[PDB]
Amino acid sequence: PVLTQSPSVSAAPRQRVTISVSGSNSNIGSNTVNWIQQLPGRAPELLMYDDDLLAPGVSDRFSGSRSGTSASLTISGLQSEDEADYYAATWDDSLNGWVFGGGTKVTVL
């Protein structure tokens, strides 16, 4: 994985969890970030795209942002159904293809 993500994050219900990712100039620095959600046992789906825009059908509780070589995913009002692995994705101009984060697991309580 060319993008650096923390392996896991935990929080209580209704709390705000922020999943960060940091890349470089050729990827996150000049291209827009996508977020991919994969629920336990389920196929992965598009969560967020173009840094801050929600995919069709996604909960409004998700928000996104990107500055410099970094980006972040923000889940608000953390619910049990958000318990999943989240992946940062963006284009890399140096590798001429898609690059991905390792993934951040979310665990609720």
Binding site: N34, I36, P44, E45, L46, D50, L53, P56, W91, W98
Partner: peptide, 14 residues
Amino acid sequence: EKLMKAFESLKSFQ
């Protein structure tokens, strides 16, 4: 084409 390109990144991912 932002949304489409984003679906193509999922296709590449999975």
